[PDB]
Amino acid sequence: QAEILRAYARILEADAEILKAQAKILEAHAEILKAQ
Amino acid sequence: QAEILRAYARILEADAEILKAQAKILEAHAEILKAQ
Amino acid sequence: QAEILRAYARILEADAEILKAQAKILEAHAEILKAQ
Amino acid sequence: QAEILRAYARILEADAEILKAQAKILEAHAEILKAQ
Amino acid sequence: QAEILRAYARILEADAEILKAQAKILEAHAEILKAQ
Amino acid sequence: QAEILRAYARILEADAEILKAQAKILEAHAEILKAQ
Amino acid sequence: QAEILRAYARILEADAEILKAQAKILEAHAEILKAQ
Amino acid sequence: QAEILRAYARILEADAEILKAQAKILEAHAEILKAQ
Amino acid sequence: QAEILRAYARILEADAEILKAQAKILEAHAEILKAQ
Amino acid sequence: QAEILRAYARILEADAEILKAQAKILEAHAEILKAQ
Amino acid sequence: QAEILRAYARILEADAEILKAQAKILEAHAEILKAQ
Amino acid sequence: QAEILRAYARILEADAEILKAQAKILEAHAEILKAQ
Amino acid sequence: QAEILRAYARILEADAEILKAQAKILEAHAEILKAQ
Amino acid sequence: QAEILRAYARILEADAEILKAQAKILEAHAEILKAQ
Amino acid sequence: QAEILRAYARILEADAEILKAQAKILEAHAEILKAQ
Amino acid sequence: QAEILRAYARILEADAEILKAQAKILEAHAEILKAQ
Amino acid sequence: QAEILRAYARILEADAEILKAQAKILEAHAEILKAQ
Amino acid sequence: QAEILRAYARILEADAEILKAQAKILEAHAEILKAQ
Amino acid sequence: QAEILRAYARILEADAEILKAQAKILEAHAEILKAQ
Amino acid sequence: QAEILRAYARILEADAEILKAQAKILEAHAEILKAQ
Amino acid sequence: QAEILRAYARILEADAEILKAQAKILEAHAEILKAQ
Amino acid sequence: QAEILRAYARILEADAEILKAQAKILEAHAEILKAQ
Amino acid sequence: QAEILRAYARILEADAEILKAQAKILEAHAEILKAQ
Amino acid sequence: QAEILRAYARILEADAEILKAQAKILEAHAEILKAQ
Amino acid sequence: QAEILRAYARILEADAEILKAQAKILEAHAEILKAQ
Amino acid sequence: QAEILRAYARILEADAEILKAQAKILEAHAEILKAQ
Amino acid sequence: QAEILRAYARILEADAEILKAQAKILEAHAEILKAQ
Amino acid sequence: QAEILRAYARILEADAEILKAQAKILEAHAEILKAQ
Amino acid sequence: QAEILRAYARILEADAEILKAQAKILEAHAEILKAQ
Amino acid sequence: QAEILRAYARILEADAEILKAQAKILEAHAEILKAQ
Amino acid sequence: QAEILRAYARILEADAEILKAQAKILEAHAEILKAQ
Amino acid sequence: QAEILRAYARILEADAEILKAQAKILEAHAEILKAQ
Amino acid sequence: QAEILRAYARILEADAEILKAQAKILEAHAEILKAQ
Amino acid sequence: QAEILRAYARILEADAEILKAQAKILEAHAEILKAQ
Amino acid sequence: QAEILRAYARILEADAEILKAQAKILEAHAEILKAQ
Amino acid sequence: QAEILRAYARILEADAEILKAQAKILEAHAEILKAQ
Amino acid sequence: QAEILRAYARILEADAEILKAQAKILEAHAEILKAQ
Amino acid sequence: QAEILRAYARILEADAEILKAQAKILEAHAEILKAQ
Amino acid sequence: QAEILRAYARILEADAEILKAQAKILEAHAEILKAQ
Amino acid sequence: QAEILRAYARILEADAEILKAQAKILEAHAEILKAQ
Amino acid sequence: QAEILRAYARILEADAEILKAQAKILEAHAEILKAQ
Amino acid sequence: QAEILRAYARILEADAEILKAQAKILEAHAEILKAQ
Amino acid sequence: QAEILRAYARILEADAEILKAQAKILEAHAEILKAQ
Amino acid sequence: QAEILRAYARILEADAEILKAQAKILEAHAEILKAQ
Amino acid sequence: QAEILRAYARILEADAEILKAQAKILEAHAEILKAQ
Amino acid sequence: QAEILRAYARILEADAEILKAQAKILEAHAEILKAQ
Amino acid sequence: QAEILRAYARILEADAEILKAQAKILEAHAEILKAQ
Amino acid sequence: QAEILRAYARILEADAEILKAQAKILEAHAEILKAQ
Amino acid sequence: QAEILRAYARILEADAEILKAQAKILEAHAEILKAQ
Amino acid sequence: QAEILRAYARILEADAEILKAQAKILEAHAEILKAQ
Amino acid sequence: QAEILRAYARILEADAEILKAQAKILEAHAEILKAQ
Amino acid sequence: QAEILRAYARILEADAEILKAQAKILEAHAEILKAQ
């Protein structure tokens, strides 16, 4: 049954990837504001 | 039933790819502003 | 029914490809501005 | 049975990754506020 | 049986990582408040 | 049998890491209160 | 047999680290009370 | 055999570290009471 | 054989460190009583 | 052979350190009684 | 040979330090009795 | 050869320090008896 | 050769210090008897 | 050559200090007998 | 040459100090006999 | 040349001090005999 | 030249002091004989 | 209830610190007047 | 109940510190008047 | 309610710090006048 | 029960300190009047 | 409501820091005048 | 039981200190009246 | 509303930093004058 | 509206950074003068 | 049992100190009346 | 309108960077003079 | 047993001190009456 | 119009980069002189 | 018109790159001198 | 056994001191009556 | 006309590339000297 | 006319390529010397 | 006439190709020496 | 005979190819598990 | 005969390839476990 | 004969490759244990 | 003949590579023990 | 002939690399012992 | 000829590297002994 | 000719590095002896 | 010509570094002797 | 010409550093002798 | 011209540093002689 | 012109420092003579 | 013009410091003569 | 105008300090003559 | 206007200090003449 | 107006101090004449 | 108004002090005339 | 109103002190005339 | 009302003191006339 538990770990890693991508969006806004 | 759970993980990874692409759009605006 | 869920994942990957292509358009504008 | 215990450790590491990503979101807000 | 004891040590290190990530969230709030 | 004794030392070091992380949480609250 | 005696010394150093971490928790409460 | 005697010295130094850490706990209580 | 005699001196210095740490505990109680 | 004689002097200095530490314990009791 | 004679002087100074430390113990008892 | 004569003077000064320390012990007993 | 004569004066001053210390011992006995 | 004559004066002053110290010993015996 | 004559005066004053110290010894015996 | 004459006066005053000190010795014997 | 004449007066006063001191010696013998 | 009584003692010590600081102000005026 | 009695002693010592500080204020006025 | 009383003590200590700082200003004027 | 009796002695010594401080206030007035 | 009272204490400590900084300015003028 | 008797002696010495302090107050009034 | 009060404390700390920086400028002038 | 007040604090911190940089310029002149 | 008898002597000396202090009070009144 | 105020803060930080760079130029001259 | 007899002498001397102190009280009344 | 103000900040940062590069040139001269 | 201002910033960054390249030339001379 | 006989002489001298003190009390009454 | 200004920036970047290439030549000489 | 200016930039980039190729020749000599 | 200028750029690129080919010859010698 | 030795090298390379192919089988299982 | 020595080097390189392939097998197991 | 010496270097490099491959095997076991 | 000396350097570098590979083996054991 | 001297430097650097690799082996043993 | 002198400096730096590596070996033994 | 003088300085700095490395060897022996 | 004089200063600083390194060697011997 | 005078000051400071280093050597001998 | 006068002051301060360093050498000899 | 007068004061203070350093040399000789 | 008058006072204080330093030299000679 | 009058008082106090320093020189000569 | 009158008193006290210092000079001559 | 009258008293006391200092000068001449 | 009358008494006491100081001057002349 | 009458008595006592001081002046003239 | 009558007695005693002082003046004239 350990397989299901690693599958939940896979979903939680995907949520971490979503939130890191939103962080990259806001860092790109910071680069736009620094470039001017 | 673990298969369905990995399929949800696949969808969440695709959402992460969408948000990374929007981050690349805004970084490209930053490169346009730095190039001038 | 997992098949339908992977098909939604296919559509979301295609949206990611669209947004990456717009990022490449704006990076090409940055290369035009750097080339002058 | 040690395998299950490492699987719980994998889930807890994934939770740590989620919270680090939220920290990166708020640090990116700090960079937006410093860039202006 | 020492293996199980190191596995408990792995879980406790993961709990330490969770709490360090919450500390990074609150330090990022401190950086937002200093940036204004 | 010394191996087991070092494994207990590993667990006690992990408990020390947990309590240091809680100390970092409260120091981050102190930084939030100083930043205002 | 000296090895076992140093292993007991390792455990006692880990107990010292635990109590120093609790001291850091209470010093962080002192910093919260000074920051207001 | 001098090695064993230095190992006993190592244990006694670790006991000194434990008691110094308890002294730091009570000094932190003193700082909490002075901060109010 | 002088080496053994310095090792006894090392043990006696460690006993001095233990008793100084207990003195620091009681001085910290004195600071708690003065802080109120 | 003078080396052995200085080693005895080292032991006697360590005994002096032990008794000074006990004096510091009792002075700390005096500070507790004065603080109330 | 004067070196040996100074080494005896070093031992006698260490005995003086021992007896001064016992004097400090009894003066600390005097401070405990005055503090009440 | 005057060096040896000053070394004897050093030993006699150390004996004076021993007897002054015993005088301080008995003066501390006098302070204990006056403090009650 | 006057140097040797001052060295004898140094020894006689050290003897005076020894006898003054014995006088201080007996004066401390007098203080013990007066304190009761 | 007057230097030697003052050095003899220094020795005679040291003898005076020795005899004054013996006088202080006997005065301390007188104080012990008066204190009872 | 007057310097030598004052140096003889210094020696005679030191002899006076020796004899005054012996007088103080015998006066201290008189105080011992009066104290009983 | 008057300086030499005052120096002789200084020597004669020192002789007077010697004889006064012997008078004090014999008066102290008189006090010993009266004290019994 | 009157200065020299006062210096002779100083010497004669010192001779008077010598003879008064011998008178005090013999009066002290008289006190010893009266004390018995 | 003794805690409240020590808290009143803390307030009275703070008043003493205020008045000592005013004394230091006027001593600094005295140093200005002495420096000219 | 002796604790309460020492707490009253602590308050009375604090009153003594207040009045000593007022004495230092007036001594500083005296130093200002002497400095002119 | 003792907490409020220590908070008043904190305010009075801050007033003491203000007045000590004004004393340091005037001592610095005294150092300027002494330096010339 | 002797402890209570020394505590009363502590209170009476504190009253003595209060009255000595008032004496120092009036001596400071005397110094102000002498300085003019 | 104690929080507001500590906030007033924070403001008064900041005023103390301002006045200490002005004291450091004038001490730096004193160092300029001493350096010449 | 002699301890209790010395404790009564301690109280009577404290009463003597109180009355000496009142004497110092009135001597300070005498100094104020002499200073005018 | 306590937030506004800490914000005023932040402004006053910034004024303290300005004045400390001017003090560092004048200390650097003092170092230039000492270096020659 | 507290945001505006922290923005004024940000400007005052930037002024502090300007003046610290001028202090570093003059300390570098001091290092040039010491290096020769 | 002689110890108890000296303790009674200590109490009687303390009574003598009380009455001498009252004598000093009345002598201070005499100084006030002479100062006018 | 707070945005404009942070933009002024950005300009003042850039001025601080200019002056720090001039300080680094003069420190590099100091290193050239020390290297010879 | 002579020790007990000297202890009775000590008590009788203390009674003499009490009565001399009462004599000083009445002489101080005489000084008050003469001062008017 | 804030955009223009950030553009001026961009120019001032570029001036800072120019002056840092000149500092690196002179530090490289210092390294040439140290390498020989 | 902001575009022209960023173009001037681009030219100033290119000047910074030129001067950094000259710094790299001189650091390479330093490496040649260290390699021998 | 002569020691006991001198101890009786010491007691009789103490009785003489008591009666002389009563004589001083009555002479002080005589001074009070003469002062009016 | 901004186009011409970016063309000047292109020329200045090419000059930077020339000077970086000369730096690489001299670093290659440094590698030849280190390889032997 | 901007075309001519980019053509000069093309020539300067070709000169950079020539000098990079000479750097690669000397790095290849360094590889020959390291290979032996 | 820009055509001629690009033709000179073509010749300079061909010279760069010649020198890169000589670099490849010497790197091939390095590979021969490493292969043995 | 070197030919046989290269033939053994050929066999060992073929074994390496077998094990790399099994690695590709398991990587293909990993791709199947990631594709769902 | 160097040819044989390079042939042994060829065999040892083939053994390295075998062990790298087993490492790739176990890394593929790690990828299977991460993919779930 | 240098050729033979480089051939021995080739064999030693092949042994290094074997041991690095065993290190990669054990790192792959570490990745398997982390993946669960 | 320098060629032979560099060939010995090549062999010693290969020995260094062997020992670094054994260090990597033992670090991989450390990673296996940390992963559990 | 300097070439030979740098070749000896190359050999000594290779010996340094050997001994650093043995240090890394023993640090890896330390990591194995800490990991348990 | 300075080149030869720097080559001797290169050899002495290589000897320093050898001895630092032996120091790292013994520090690694210290870490092994602390890890147990 | 100054170049030669700096080259001698380079050699003397290398000798300093050798002796510092021997100091680090003996400090590592001290750490081995403290670790047991 | 000042350059030569600073070069002599560089040599004298290098001699100071040599002697400080020998001091560190002997302090490390002191640490070895204290560690036993 | 002041530059030359500061260069002489630099040489004299270097001589001071040499003599301080010899003082540190002899203090390290003192620490070796105290450590035994 | 005041600059030259401060430069002479710099030289005289350097002479003071030389003589203080010789004083530290002789104090270190005193510590060597006391340590035996 | 006052600046020149303070510069003369600086020179006279430096002469005072020279003579104080010679006093410290001779006090260190006194400590050497007392240590034997 | 008072500034000039204080500058003359500064010079006279420096002369006082010179003469006090010569007094310390001669007191150090006195300590050398007493130490023998 | 009182300021000028205090400045004259400052000069007269400095003259007093000069003459006290000459008195200390001659008292040090007296100590040299007494020490022999 | 009383301030001016106290300033005249300050000058007259400074004249008294000058004449007391001359008295100390002549008393030091008296001590030189007595020391011989 | 009484203040002015006490200021005249202060001046007259300062005149008394001047004349007492002249008396001390002439008494010091008397001591010089007695010392010879 | 009695205050003014005591102020006149203060002035008359100061006149008495002046005339007593003149009496001490003439008594010092008498001592000079007796000392010769 | 008796206070005023004692104040007149104080003035008359001060007149008595003035006339006694004139008597001491004339007695000092008598001592000058007797000393010759 | 008797108090007023004693105050008149105090005034009449002060008149007696005035007339006794005039008698002492005329007796001092008698001593001047007898001394000649």
Residue numbers in the entry:
A (entry chain j), B (entry chain p), C (entry chain v), D (entry chain d), E (entry chain X), F (entry chain R), ...: 1 to 36
Pull text from the paper.
Therefore, the designed series of Form I-like peptides encompassed minimal peptide sequences in which the structurally determinative distance between the RxxxR motif and the C-terminus was systematically varied over the range from 2 to 5 heptad repeats. Three filaments, derived from peptides 15-10-3, 29-24-3, and 36-31-3, were selected for further analysis using cryo-EM imaging with direct electron detection. Five protofilaments interacted to form the 15-10-3 filament, four interacted in the 29-24-3 filament, and three interacted in the 36-31-3 filament. Similarly, the 4-start helices of 29-17-3 and 29-24-3 and the 3-start helices of 36-31-3, passing through every fourth subunit and every third subunit, respectively, were associated with the axial stacking direction of the protofilaments within the corresponding assemblies. Similarly, the filament structure of 36-31-3 revealed that the C-terminus of peptide (i) interacted with the axially offset RxxxR motif of peptide (i + 5) within the 1-start (C1) symmetry of the assembly. Finally, while the local helix crossing angle associated with the arginine clasp interaction was maintained at 94°, the distal segments of the 36-31-3 helices bend at a more acute crossing angle of 80° in order to maintain the overall helical symmetry of the filament. The results of this analysis are reported for the 36-31-3 filament, although similar results were obtained for the other Form I-like assemblies. The motif comprised a seven-residue helical fragment containing the RxxxR motif and a five-residue fragment from the C-terminus of a laterally interacting helix. Rather, some of the closest matches arose in the context of an internal helix-helix interaction between two closely-approaching helices, necessitating a Gly at the position above. The results suggested that the arginine clasp motif, which involves a helix terminus interacting with the side of another helix at a nearly 100° angle, was not common within the structures of naturally occurring proteins and, consequently, not natively designable.
